[PDB]
Structure formats: C-alpha cells, structure tokens
Amino acid sequence: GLTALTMAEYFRDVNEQDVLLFIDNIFRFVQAGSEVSALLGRMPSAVGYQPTLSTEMGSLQERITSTKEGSITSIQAVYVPADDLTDPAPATTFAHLDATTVLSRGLAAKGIYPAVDPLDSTSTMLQPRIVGEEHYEIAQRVKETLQRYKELQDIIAILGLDELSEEDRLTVARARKIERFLSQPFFVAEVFTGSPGKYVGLAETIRGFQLILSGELDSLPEQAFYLVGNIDEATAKAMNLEMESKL
Amino acid sequence: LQPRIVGEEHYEIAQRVKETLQRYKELQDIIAILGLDELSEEDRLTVARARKIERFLSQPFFVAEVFTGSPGKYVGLAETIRGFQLILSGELDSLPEQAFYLVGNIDEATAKAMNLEMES
Amino acid sequence: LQPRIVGEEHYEIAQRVKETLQRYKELQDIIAILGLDELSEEDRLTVARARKIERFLSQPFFVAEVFTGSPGKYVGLAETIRGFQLILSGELDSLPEQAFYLVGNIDEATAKAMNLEMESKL
Amino acid sequence: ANLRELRDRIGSVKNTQKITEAMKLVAAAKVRRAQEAVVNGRPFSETLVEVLYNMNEQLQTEDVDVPLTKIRTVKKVALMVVTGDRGLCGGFNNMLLKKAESRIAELKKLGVDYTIISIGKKGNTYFIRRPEIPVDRYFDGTNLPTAKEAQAIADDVFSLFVSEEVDKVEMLYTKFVSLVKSDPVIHTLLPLSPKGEICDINGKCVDAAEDELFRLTTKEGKLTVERDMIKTETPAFSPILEFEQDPAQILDALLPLYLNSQILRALQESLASELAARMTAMSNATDNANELKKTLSINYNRARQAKITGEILEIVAGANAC
Amino acid sequence: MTLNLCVLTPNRSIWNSEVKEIILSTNSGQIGVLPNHAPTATAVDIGILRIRLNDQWLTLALMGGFARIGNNEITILVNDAERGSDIDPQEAQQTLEIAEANLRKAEGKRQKIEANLALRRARTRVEASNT
Amino acid sequence: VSRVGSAAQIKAMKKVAGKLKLELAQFAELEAFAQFASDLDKATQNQLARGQRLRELLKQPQSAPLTVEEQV
Amino acid sequence: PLQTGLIAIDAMIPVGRGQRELIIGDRQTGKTAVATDTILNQQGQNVICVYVAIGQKASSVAQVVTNFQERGAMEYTIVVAETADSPATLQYLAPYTGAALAEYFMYRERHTLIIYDDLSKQAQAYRQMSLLLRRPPGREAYPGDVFYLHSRLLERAAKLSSLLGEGSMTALPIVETQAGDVSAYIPTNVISITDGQIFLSADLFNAGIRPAINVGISVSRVGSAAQIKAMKKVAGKLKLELAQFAELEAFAQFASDLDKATQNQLARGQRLRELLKQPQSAPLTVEEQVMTIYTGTNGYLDSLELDQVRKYLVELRTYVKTNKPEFQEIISSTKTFTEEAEALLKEAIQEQMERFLLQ
Amino acid sequence: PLQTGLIAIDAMIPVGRGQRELIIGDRQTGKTAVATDTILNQQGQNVICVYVAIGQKASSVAQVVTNFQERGA
C-alpha cells in the first residue's frame, strides 16, 4: 500500500495531476500489519489487532490529501469482519472515509448497472453548504421518492397501482423512472453491452433529475430512461420507442 | 429482611412486592415483543400492579431538588408498608400510574391522582 | 447408519424420525410465541408425533432403577423399528403423550395408555 | 457456549420478525378479500331495502302485523355479541367483551332479563369460563362466515323471536371504520322499523351515518381506509307491482331476508375489523422484533469482541509467564 | 328468447341467465311465469323452483325468499339457493332421519319452530335433489 | 441431581417418592408447553393441577424441618 | 468446468479447472462426501485426483481408499495419508507433498484435482510446532504466519498459460467450523484466500436435504465461466426460481390464503428442492443434470407429488439414457442445449409421464 | 453561565464556567460542530479558547482552523 501511495504521490506532487489511488481490500492491509506485529512479538491490542493500529492506518491515510499541486482521491474496498461495523478494522477505517458506495446484488440482478444502492450509500459532501441548496434539495427529493417506492412495494403487491391514491401512483411512476435513470452505459462495459457509453457531468445530472422529478417528463415510458445519460438522450430514446408505436 | 428482625408484616409485604416484580420481570420480553393485549386477565392485573409498584418506588430527594423540583420527601417505614399494602390489596387499582411517580406517602399519590383528574 | 449397512427399512425410519424432530425443532419459535392453536393442519400432526417420538426415545435402564424408580427394559432393534413405524404411521395418534414416557416397547406404550385411560375414567 | 446460544437467540428473533411480517401481509390480503365480499353482497341488500321501503309505503295503511315489526313492550332483552374467531386480535376481543360487560351491567340493573348469544370463538370461550352469564347458543368460525354461519344465526334468532319468548334482540359488533381504531356499536336488530332501517340500541335511526363500502387506499405511503356515503342506490321508483300474495304475508315472507342480510353484513364487518386489528398488531410486533434484533446484534458483537480480547490476553499472559 | 332471470343469495349473485318457463313455489301455491309477463310481485315459499332452459327442464334448490317480476327483467331474492343439483339424495336421507329424530327430542316451543323449519328445508332439499 | 439416588432413602421414601423427580420434570415441560395451548384436554388439566399442588407442597420455611414420617 | 456430479454444485456454485473452492461446513455435514463424489465423478474426464488425509483416523482413510478401489476411482487417484498419530511436522508437510505431486502432473500438461481434507488439522499441527519452538502466538494461539501457511499452499492451484501447457490444478480445501462460527480465525483466512466457498448446514442435513448445501450463502467468484453452454441456460431459470422460493419461504405456512402465482412459486420451489437431493457416492453426468434442471425448471414435474419427484426423475434419466442417446450425444459433443435436444427431451418427458402414470 | 449559542444546550443542558461537560456520541454525529459553535460564540465574552485535536485527520483540522480564522475567533 505504501508502494502504491508513493507512486501516486509522485504523480500528484511532481506533475500536479489529480490522481485516483485505488486500494484493494484495505482489511488485508490491517491484517498483514497484525500478522507482522504478532511475529515481532508485540502485545496485541483489543480484539487481537496490533497496538499500532490507529497510527499504522493514519500513516497511510494521511498522504491521500490535496495539496496546492493536485489531489489524490482514494477508493478503498472495505471488508467488515464478522459483518459488524464496530470491529477495530472498520472502526478505524471509517474514521478516514469521506463517502461510501454500496453495490447491491439486487440492482445488479435486475439490470440497473451500475449496481450502486442509492439509499444505503452515504456521503458527507451531500450538504447544502458544500454542494449548493439546489443540488441538496433535488438529492433529498430523489431519496424521498425512492424511499416511498420501497415502502409502497408491498402495498402495490397486495392492492395494485390502480388502488393507490393519485399522489402515491404519481410517486410510484416517478420513482420507477428514477430507478431506471440512475443506470448508465459505461465506456468500459461498452465492449460487451454494445451501448457506446456516456459521461454525464453533474449539471446535466441535476437538470435531468429536476425535469424527471417535476411533472414535465411524466408522459414517457419507463424504458426510455433506462441505460442512457443526459436526459435529452432519454427524450430521443422516447421518440424512438414512440416511432415503434406509430409504425 | 427476615421475619424475626423486621417483623412478619414488613416481611410479607416485601415478599409480595418481590413476587409481583419477579412475575413482571419474567413476562417482560413477551410483553416487549407482543404487548399487553395477549396476556391473561391475572397477568394484566399483575402487570398493572407491578407498574404501580415500580412508580411508587421512586421518590423526591432533598439533595436532588435542582433536578426534579417538587422538593424531597422523607417517608417512614410504616407509611411505606401501608402504601404497599394499599397497592397490592387492590384498593388503589383505578387511578393513573403517574399518580405514584416521584411522591412519598401514598396519601400523596391519592392527592396527585385527584389533582390530575380534576385538572384533566 | 448407511442403507447398505443397516437395511432400507431401518435407514428410512431413522431418516423420518430425524426429519420429524428437526421440523419440530424448527417450528419451536413459531409455536412458543404465536400460539399452537393457529398452526396449520400438517404442523399440528408434526408437533403431536414429534412429542410422542420424544417421549418414546426415553427408556428405563436396568442399572438406573435407583433413579427412574421403575424396572429396566431391554429393547431389541426390530421392536424399536416397529414401534417408531407405528408412531409415525399415524395409528398411535390416540394414545396420550405420557403413555410413551419411560416404556420399554410399543406394547408397553399401549398398556400404559390403557392404564392412563382407566385412571382418568375411574 | 454463551456466544452460540446468543447467535441462536438472534436467529430465533429473525425468524419471529419474518413470520410476523408474513402474518401482516396475509392479513392485509384477507382484509382486501373481506372488502370484496362486502361490495359483492351489497346489491342484494340494496334491492331488498328499496323493495321493502316501497312495499311498506304500500302497507302503512294496512294491517301487516308481522312478528318481526311488532313491538312487545314488556321488554325482555336478548343481547348478541360477535367476536374474533382467531387470536391476537390486537385488542379486538378485549374491547368487545368489555362493552358486553358494560351492557349487561346496565341491563341486569333494570331487571330487563338480559341474555347473551355468542358467535365468536374468543367470545364463547370467555363466556364458558365465566359461567355467571346466561347464554343462548354457541357458534364458531371454522364454518365459513360468508353463508352458512350467518344463515344458522338468522335461523336461531328468527326462531327465538317468532316464538315470542324475548323482545329486543340487539347486536354488538365492531364496524371497520379505521385501521388503528374500531369502536364497537350496539344496533338493535329484531324490533325493526317498518320502513326497513337499521337502528341503534335505543333506535334513533343510525342508518343515516352507516358509511357503506369502506375501501383501502394509501394516504402518502401507508395504507388507510376511505369511507363515503351513498353508492348505486335507486330506491325512489315503484311501479304497479300487482301483488299475487297477501299484502301482509308479502312482508311476512320478505323480512327474514332483511334479518339474514343484516346478520351477514355484521359478520363481514366484524371479520374485516378483526383482520385489520391483526394487521396492525403484527406490524407493531414486526417493528418491535426489528429493534430487538438490532439490540441483540449489538450486544452479541460486544460479547464477541470481549471474548476474543479475553482469550488472547489470557494466552499471551501464559506465554509471557513461561 | 325469454325473460331475464337472476337468483340472488345474501352474499353472491348466483346466475344472471334467462330460462324459458319457470314454476315458482309461492306461499299461495305453485305459479308459473310466462314470457312477457305483466309485473307481479309474489312471495316465495321454501319449496321447489324449476326452470326451462328451452333445452331441458331443470330445478333450482332454494331455502325460501321473495321474487319480483319485472318487464322481462325479474329478480329473485332468496335466503339460500343451490343452483341445480349439487348434493346427492343419500346424504339428504341421512340428514332427514336426524331431522325427524331431533324433532322428537327438541319439543320446546321455540325448538318447535326450529325443527319445523329444519323439516320444511330438508324436505325441499330432498325434492330438489330428486334431479 | 443426586448421583446416589433412592439408595440414600428409606424404603418408605423409596416407595412413595421413587418416580417423582422424572414426573415433576415432565410436568414442568408439560406446563411450559401448555402456556401457548388454547384448548386443553381434561387429563392435561388434571396433570397440571397435580403438578401445581406438588409445587405448593415443596415449600419449606428456613430452619423448620420435617422428619421422615412427616415427609412420607 | 470441473464437473463435481452434484447438480446443486454444478448449477449454482460452478467450479472451474484452476479454481480454489472451499468446502466449509460443520462436523458431519457431508464435506468428505462431496469430496468423494467429485473424485468419483472425475472418472470419464482425464483428471488426476489427489486426496490429502490430514490427521484422520486410519480406519477412515482405509474406508475411503477401499471405496475408491471399489468404484474404480483408484486408477487415476493418489492418496496422501497422515493420520493423527503422526508428528505435527508430517501433518503440516502432507498438503505440500500433495501439492508437489499435483504440480508435477500439472506441468506435464495434465489437469489435476487436489482435496485437502481438514486443512484445520494442518493449521493445528503448525500451531503445535510453532508453540513448541517458543514463537509468539496470536489469536487462538496461532502463529502470525498461519495465513502465510495457507496462502502459500493455495496459490499453487493455477490454470496455466497455454504456453506452459494448458494444465491446471483445482484445489478443494476442507475447513470445519465449530458452533457455526464462520468468523473463526482459520475459516476467515481460508475464506479470504479461496476463490469461492461452499457452505454446509447441519439443519439442512437433518431436514433431509443431502448434500446439505446452503446455496443462499455459498459463493463462487469464477461464476458461469465454469459452466458449459448447455448448463447456463437451465441454471438461469434454476437460480431465479430458487431465489423466489427463498423469498416466499416464510409464507409457506400461509400458502392457502395467497395469490395463485405465489402458491405456484411456492410449490415450484418446494419441488425444485426435491431434485437437489442426491444420494452419497452417486454423481450425475452433466447431461443427466442438464435434463433434470430443464424438467424441474420448466414445470414438467409440477403435477407429481413430492414423494414421487425423485423416483420419477430416476426413471426418467434412465429412460432417456437408454432410449434417446441422441440427447446425450448432442449435449456431449456440441456442449449446448440445442433445440433438437429440447425436442428429444420433451418427447422423452411425455412418454415417461405416460409410462409413470401407467404405474 | 458559559453560553454556547445553541438554544438546546443553553436551555436544557446549561454549562457554567468551571464545569467539565462531556460531548459524547457516535462518529459524524456532531460534537465538533458543537465544539466550534461554543468557541465561535465567545466573541464578546472575555474567554480564552483552547482546542486540542488529538487524532483528527489533517483536513479536519484545516477546516476548523480556517473557519476560526474567517469568523474571527
């Protein structure tokens, strides 16, 4: 890990680049440290880890920063031992994490790659002061719509969409379209999915979600938003799905 | 707590209090998941009496007048014994649980219950 | 307990006893809180037969008549197979559970059932 | 073996949560089916009440003198109670039996010679274990309440009345008006108005606010009910019906249909209300088992870390002692 | 080719199909309704209601009620109706023997009426199970 | 438990209290299982009643003993 | 693909040549049984098999080797045996000699299979000698290089590079958990090292379902690349339907008052579970299990009773293998589930349903 | 009183000068927003403030110190 961090710090410092340092399972870094301390004979810390757990972790995490030159951003895979977030490997890993993306087998199976869970993913950046009041409120409204959909899935399973209230039906349709619009074709997954892949900045993101969330894009199918970016492409796919009907 | 040291009346009242509290502690987890609606009539009566007992156990302190207000009460032993005889005997069975919370000398519990019902 | 070693009748009756006891152990918390009355028709029969099997697994030992206070019994293998096959056949559904407690074989179970019925009537 | 029994307790709590949410969902399905049953049994009673209103208007000047509309003011009383068949009920059967205790406590005072017909299972178990109450019949929910239970009840109460042994057969049931709350009502049944309107225990025409055809719709993300006033009713017109039977005997052959329809409607309402109470009780129990599972998982993680710590500290203490 | 006929039990609509000739077991006696009948409102007895499918004359098993005749759109409100034959007569005789037995047992003035209604309904149960 | 068992008892106590521990454990399990049973048999109610009478009999004030004939 | 003969493995947790799959379970759940079924299923394939018995009882190894000689799986197998009376050094060295033998055969262009039965015993032997050499212990007194012990061994199981010979060595280590503690030290080590894990449950073993594979918690990081083209088609439907059954399983006691589609999915899952059952030392060929999955997942056994599904399937597999060898040939040569194979299979299913309803 | 500026603290958990009041919670539940609120509230009062960051990441200290500098504390 320190070898990788040195190779990344060169690119940051000397070339003034924005570096993306990918760590593999950072649990195995902590585990290898616990191994070398058990070998050197030191007395273990609480749940069996090395006594130098917090300092060993900090000596790594304190060089993934942003200087006046560039910025190293790290995306670290985190394994939770015994699935508890209170174990000293997650308890000290999470003292250095800024955001969190959970990848969901549900979305991976139902075809909504990238399979990031929208509700179990967090970020300390998603605050008004940091991202703008508009961005914050649209993100909160999308989370509320998805949460209402997840709460209403069982009710629509029992009764049906024709038996819900009008506002709840409108919510269910909007959330369906939103869940399908979170998906995106990748420049890398292009080679087997075939779709040419898209890059979608944040401005077009919030502007497409504002439209799909207000009552402007309500007269469109669900599969017109699926696997596109840049909501104008969603309207183009919609026009194609309507050409299939006028034909 | 022996019938030869504290007398038989004190001993029997303490035993009955601990018995109802033990029954309550037993069915605590069942009434935590399910609730009181599933218990029998005698078990519901024991639950209500155990709740009145655990409220009549609290008391205002002179040294804690800053935290609770409602200044402290000194309660003798005879008053405690009469109050718990009154609770377990079924006489004080139709008055709110909050009438017993943070008082001394169960005549104050009755005064508080009357005040609460008249205030609504 | 392999079929080729133990015989198909023995192997299958052992498997059925073990499945009934495991199903009863898995039904334990859906009973212990939610009520034995609301249970389905198949699970009530499972619970009844599994309690009868649990009682019938017990046996008085010759060396333990100081503890059980009753004479001990030697039970051959064929009588065990026949007794458990009777129990989970469904024809011993009429005997009380306690008629299967601490009995040698299944004729002792039926005799104890008869005695219990006599004590209950007169 | 303490950690393993903790793991097993947590697993049993997970099983309890899964089965309580299954019970909640199947109770919601059964509420929807009971609503379907009510809306399917509606039009029969609609045509019946319009026919009977017209015929009574054709008979107010007449001498109808049917035993069902007749008033026997000597006032014996026959309270009847429907209760929950199955269990856990939220607090359904408790409130029902409690209002029954209230009514009989008011009645045995006045000497009106009360008596009780129990229809539910929890009700009749309560009544047999509390033998200080006179009782007339027992019924159960094993038999379906859709047709045969209610038809037997109608037979029993009809033969109770026309053999003029008792007056004032009134019913205690619990109309499904809301998910979390369902307050029981006492409606009189047999001393019925000739118009054909269901009354209250006193009789001040509570058919006005009956709010037919409850239905289930969510409000914002959670299921509620919505109950309106008047649907698909055409009672006004009555052509020349040119009766073939006797004008009083027409009502004599008609009014048992009103008795059966009212009893069946009350059974369907109390069934839907019992299932709604069960749904809300199982929702509460699922939520409580959820928070209990969370607390158990926290305590177990703490115990596991403490066990690992103590074990390794003991091992290293022994090694350093060597 | 005939007037519309509907039987309605308290919970469900039985069948909204029309049949040609219908004999009605009434309180005054068996009457038959002819197509394009003038509207006559008749009371119904616990008896045998039979239909004419214009292909085969068939019976309905009802437990009482009241029938209205409309302008070729008639309604029959009953207490309990069994369309056609659904039970066989053998269980019906195994039930009539207990019917006549419990009449002898139950002789209270209210149980008098209970057993009399049990007889009146069991009899029409059999005489509708005839076909 | 007692590893010595009824050999540490007089013949009177062996006669009257030989099969009692196992039946008391069986009653305890039965009474546990009958808490979540709605309808009961008459024999089950009688067994429950006997178990509860015995459990009331099992009580003793401290330093207030019974002899062997009182125990019998 | 590395065919294990167990349908629930080859469809749900497929193992490939060069993959390290963990057979982890509790005691007496069927780990050795799964290993033996795989070694017996390697009969047709030219896979050299290695079974390493570490700290076992000598009569257990005797029974296993006589079972091998009986079923004829001894001509392509080697048995490395270090019983529990051996010094700790020999039980610690035995898996490495097994790996050396399999490496010889692997680098000579042959495909090999190695089973390390109870690697936990090797870890305990290494812990014993580490403690006796006075080394600083760790958690559960294990030396800090016990992960190195296990990883240095498991990384030898490779799939070579087509210029080294296209050979491979599949490793099937066996790890025994205690009291269901998957978070125990050595199980976590081997779970971190190996490609996938195959969990066995004592509750499933007692409930009758044997082999007691807990598919909901078993993973295979290799995925469908360890399958033939004929198996992925039917495995998709098997996966989807078993997942739906696992969802609705809590609703099985309320099946009567449920939707018809939900009752259908519940019955479908509860009779798909019946075809996952399998007797010991009877591995199925890939065509037999393809036909079994096809029938079950399409619903040509949604009419029979659960006490008849297994018997019907045995009679059906024998019927197809005897009467219509063209289906076996299509699935064997082309390795794909051809529409002609579907036609032959539907004809055989119809004819066998008639012959079975003839009783 | 030692006023923190927060209504809830100053109303229900009042703190005086000379009291050791603990700020206890999970991670990212506050406590540093609270600490900085109490420090920024001492502008008029004649109170020296000390802030010891014992194991925080360097960027958190950077944010806190720049907020202090900007707001004048």
Ligand SMILES: Nc1ncnc2c1ncn2[C@@H]1O[C@H](COP(=O)(O)OP(=O)(O)OP(=O)(O)O)[C@@H](O)[C@H]1O
């Ligand atoms: N598929 C199966 N069908 C029937 N029985 C089986 C099956 N698999 C295993 N068994 C039975 O389970 C018993 C134990 O199996 P096995 O020894 O393979 O498990 P194990 O976990 O290796 O045992 P141990 O824990 O002693 O190592 C054996 O008697 C065997 O017959």
Ligand SMILES: Nc1ncnc2c1ncn2[C@@H]1O[C@H](COP(=O)(O)OP(=O)(O)OP(=O)(O)O)[C@@H](O)[C@H]1O
């Ligand atoms: N009162 C508040 N209003 C708005 N945002 C707040 C408030 N308090 C805290 N936050 C936001 O919540 C996030 C966490 O708060 P804070 O920095 O106080 O916790 P913390 O002490 O850093 O937790 P930890 O040190 O364990 O990470 C911060 O990014 C902050 O912007």
